[PDB]
Every structure is written in C-alpha cells, then in structure tokens.
Design a protein around this ligand. Structure first.
Ligand code: CL
Ligand code: MG
Length: 198
C-alpha cells in the first residue's frame, strides 16, 4: 500500500507559459531569449543552485547588453509561471489526511519565492500547510532525473520508495523514479489528476 506522495511542482501544480515568458523578456530588450534555451548555461546552473540569484540576473544582463533592474528581470522570469488552481490546493490539503505529502521540483530561488508569495497563499494556508517537506533542486544541488535526487529524497525523509507515489509530468523523471521502485503517474499538460484518488 502507498503511504507517501511525491508531487512535482511545474505543470503538475503550477500552470506554465513559456511563450509569455519569452515575450516578456523581449519587451525588456532581450531579443534572442528564445535562442538561450546549454549545460554550462545560467538556467541550468541556477536550477542546481550552482550560481546565486544575483549571479543569474547579472548573467541575464550580460547576454542582454543593457541596463535592467532586478525587479524587471524577476518579473519577466516569473511570468513563465501562471497559477496553481485553488482546487489543487484543496486536493493537497484533502490528501494530507491519508498520505504524507512531499514536493520534489526542479526550480530556482527566484521562481520558488514567487510561488511561495503568489501561488500557495490561500485562505489561511501557506506553503508549509501543504507539504511535510519541500525538496528543491537548487537547494539540493541536484536535479531530476538524476537517480541520486530520488535516493536523497527518500533517505532524508526516512520513507520507503516502495510505499511512495510520484506524480510528475516529465516521462523521463517518472521512468528513473520507477527504477528505484517508486510508483508513478505522468499527468498531461493542464490535467486534473484528482481522478487518481476516487
Ligand atoms: Cl535593481
Ligand atoms: Mg513538472
């Protein structure tokens, strides 16, 4: 039987808009934003916490070749994120009654702060209300689908992979998780996956 839920953030909870993000970057003068997404790239580095938010911005400034404020950069980068529908927050709260609920996400400090400020706050609830713990690539200095991030998660949480269900819209991420004995489901873009618990 399953005791634990590993929930993905991107797509599974928060709706994403790459086109909007691209458009917002071009409107502040980063014309070729769409050509910039590399393994040594600032996007990959910040995902794994190898650089700081300050370094990321300066990275953007650098390939941008222009004066642009921190808030402007953050606003455009954050525009990639849209919303977490509130029925998914209800679902998470509802689920805590029967499972231990965790988050595992490839994300970055800038996005995470925006998410904790703007998507999770709901009624009286904040991010802490939804999860036993949040596992974030840039804090763990690793990234899905590295086999080690899954091991690192179950060991740090003290949970058995075989009693854990993983929900993530990346197939590759699910397929590696499966190797470790974790059960998985791969929701489609914008899918309401509450059907899993009926
Ligand atoms: Cl600034
Ligand atoms: Mg995702």
């Amino acid at each position: 039987g399953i005791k634990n839920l590993l929930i993905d953030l991107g797509g599974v909870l928060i709706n994403l808009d790459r086109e909007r993000c691209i458009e917002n970057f071009k409107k502040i003068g980063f014309q070729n934003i769409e050509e910039k997404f590399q393994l040594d790239g600032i996007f990959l580095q910040q995902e794994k916490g190898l650089i700081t938010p300050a370094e990321f911005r300066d990275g953007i400034r650098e390939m941008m070749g222009k004066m642009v404020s921190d808030k402007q950069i953050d606003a455009a980068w954050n525009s990639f994120l849209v919303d977490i529908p509130t029925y998914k927050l209800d679902l998470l709260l509802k689920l805590r009654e029967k499972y231990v609920v965790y988050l595992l996400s490839n994300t970055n400090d800038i996005h995470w702060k925006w998410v904790c400020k703007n998507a999770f706050p709901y009624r009286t609830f904040k991010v802490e209300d939804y999860f036993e713990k949040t596992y974030l690539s840039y804090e763990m200095k690793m990234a899905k689908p590295e086999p080690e991030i899954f091991k690192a998660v179950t060991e740090d949480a003290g949970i058995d992979p075989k009693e854990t269900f993983f929900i993530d819209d990346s197939e590759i991420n699910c397929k590696v998780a499966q190797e470790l004995g974790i059960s998985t489901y791969t929701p489609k873009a914008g899918e309401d996956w509450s059907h899993l618990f009926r």
